[PDB]
């Protein structure tokens, strides 16, 4: 149907918008602490601590497979990244601090992104 094409055209454009958003957020992790998943060879015990790991490469795979049906699904994954970090790593570490900074800076981009999705539909 033409009605299915118009939903697909909208998902496609959402995907267009989110790819910009992801790039912008990943620019706020210049150290690339969150660029890839946590290695289970290097942190074997990790899944005993973190039940739902998340990273930017995993978000990017899902993104190009038009897997985010809305902005809230995308926000949940971003917040995993931050929230998983701040549980695993202690307050006085470079990892924890990197997340705090990504959260604060990330929120500004997301504030406007919410406004563009509502506006554009």
Curated annotation (Swiss-Prot):
Transmembrane segments: none annotated. There is a cross-link at residue 41 (Glycyl lysine isopeptide (Lys-Gly) (interchain with G-Cter in SUMO2)). It is found in: Nucleus; Chromosome. Residues 9-113 form the Bromo domain. It comes from the Eukaryota. Highly expressed in testis. Scaffold subunit of various histone acetyltransferase (HAT) complexes, such as the MOZ/MORF and HBO1 complexes, that acts as a regulator of hematopoiesis. Plays a key role in HBO1 complex by directing KAT7/HBO1 specificity towards histone H3 'Lys-14' acetylation (H3K14ac), thereby promoting erythroid differentiation. Component of some HBO1 complex composed of KAT7/HBO1, MEAF6, ING4 and BRD1/BRPF2. Component of the MOZ/MORF complex composed at least of ING5, KAT6A, KAT6B, MEAF6 and one of BRPF1, BRD1/BRPF2 and BRPF3. Interacts (via PHD-type zinc finger domain) with unmodified histone H3. Interacts (via PWWP domain) with dimethylated and trimethylated 'Lys-79' on histone H3. This is Bromodomain-containing protein 1. The gene is BRD1. The chain holds residues 555 to 674 of 1058 of the full protein.
């Amino acid at each position: 149907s033409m009605e299915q094409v118009a939903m697909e055209l909208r998902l496609t454009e959402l995907t267009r918008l989110l790819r910009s958003v992801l790039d912008q957020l990943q620019d706020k992790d210049p150290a690339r602490i969150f660029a890839q998943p946590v290695s289970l060879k290097e942190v074997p015990d990790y899944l005993d601590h973190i039940k739902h790991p998340m990273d930017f490469a995993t978000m990017r795979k899902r993104l190009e497979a038009q897997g985010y049906k809305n902005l809230h699904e995308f926000e949940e994954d971003f917040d995993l990244i931050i929230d998983n970090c701040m549980k695993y790593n202690a307050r006085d570490t470079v990892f924890y601090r990197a997340a705090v900074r990504l959260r604060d800076q990330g929120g500004v981009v997301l504030r406007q992104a919410r406004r563009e999705v509502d506006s554009i539909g």
